[PDB]
Amino acid sequence: QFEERHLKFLQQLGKGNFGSVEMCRYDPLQDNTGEVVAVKKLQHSTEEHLRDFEREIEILKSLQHDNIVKYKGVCYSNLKLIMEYLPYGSLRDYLQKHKERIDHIKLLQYTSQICKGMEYLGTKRYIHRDLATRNILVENENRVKIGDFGLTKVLPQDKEYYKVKEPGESPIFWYAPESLTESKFSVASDVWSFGVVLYELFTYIEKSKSPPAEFMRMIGNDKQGQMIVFHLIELLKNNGRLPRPDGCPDEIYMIMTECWNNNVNQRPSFRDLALRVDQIRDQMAG
Numbered sequence: 001q002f003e004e005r006h007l008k009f010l011q012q013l014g015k016g017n018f019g020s021v022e023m024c025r026y027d028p029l030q031d032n033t034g035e036v037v038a039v040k041k042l043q044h045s046t047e048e049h050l051r052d053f054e055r056e057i058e059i060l061k062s063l064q065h066d067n068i069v070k071y072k073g074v075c076y077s078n079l080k081l082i083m084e085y086l087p088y089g090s091l092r093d094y095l096q097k098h099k100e101r102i103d104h105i106k107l108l109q110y111t112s113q114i115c116k117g118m119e120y121l122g123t124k125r126y127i128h129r130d131l132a133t134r135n136i137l138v139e140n141e142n143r144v145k146i147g148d149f150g151l152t153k154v155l156p157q158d159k160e161y162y163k164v165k166e167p168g169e170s171p172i173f174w175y176a177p178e179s180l181t182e183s184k185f186s187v188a189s190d191v192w193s194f195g196v197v198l199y200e201l202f203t204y205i206e207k208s209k210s211p212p213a214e215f216m217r218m219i220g221n222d223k224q225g226q227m228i229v230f231h232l233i234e235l236l237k238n239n240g241r242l243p244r245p246d247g248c249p250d251e252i253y254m255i256m257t258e259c260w261n262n263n264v265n266q267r268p269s270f271r272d273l274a275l276r277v278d279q280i281r282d283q284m285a286g
């Protein structure tokens, strides 16, 4: 267990969907040699949010995979989540800064790694509901892990989707059509969101070309609030889609579009996605 009082703040790391994450030193000997860790805490520690956060903790805790940020422990008073600190930040920021000097062999290594993290997630009947480069952490040049399980849901035994009311703030531009119209979330809607993560990676996080900027362009920048969703549904219903990023290999663009399939059952599995992505990296390499 970790004791609250030995956590020494160093710096903020970031805010996610409902909390905050700090860089801290667990230094129980006060001589300043202790382990640097990542720490999550609730900004608005409601009784509602406190349940979801402990639910979040219990999900992370139960997930052990090379491509899923490690759980280390909790602190009691209100709860704090202790996690491994990954020094390179979010993939969104790392790729944005180091643009294009990250070649395609690298993007596909991360892609592969993302796929495997999700395949295992799904093996435990969990649905992330927020797969996005900003929620993916970089350990080092050669490793990313999936993180921020704040919006994750377990499937019921006999259902294969999870229907949510009442929705909080929602990454709509990553949402598959049936999540927007019906609030059905599933392994399949995470696969849709994975297609957008792949789009993100191959745009190198150019800000003019992000999903929000581009979907907003397509439906009209004049669309506001609730209407954005109305027009997005219609757009997606008619095969309005994010364009192929400048320079994107062709068989990477096909993976994107296969994921963004209105027909829910016709989307690839992560098992097939991981195989496919690894196959492309083989031939690139030779």
Ligand SMILES: O=C(Nc1c[nH]nc1-c1nc2ccc(C[NH+]3CCOCC3)cc2[nH]1)NC1CC1
Binding pocket: 013, 014, 015, 016, 021, 038, 069, 083, 084, 085, 086, 087, 088, 089, 090, 137, 147, 148
């Ligand atoms: O849980 C989170 N992340 C982490 C778990 N373990 N380690 C992290 C983490 N988040 C980071 C955010 C930014 C940075 C970059 N800075 C590191 C120190 O020098 C300046 C740049 C690292 C992060 N590690 N992500 C929340 C912050 C969005």
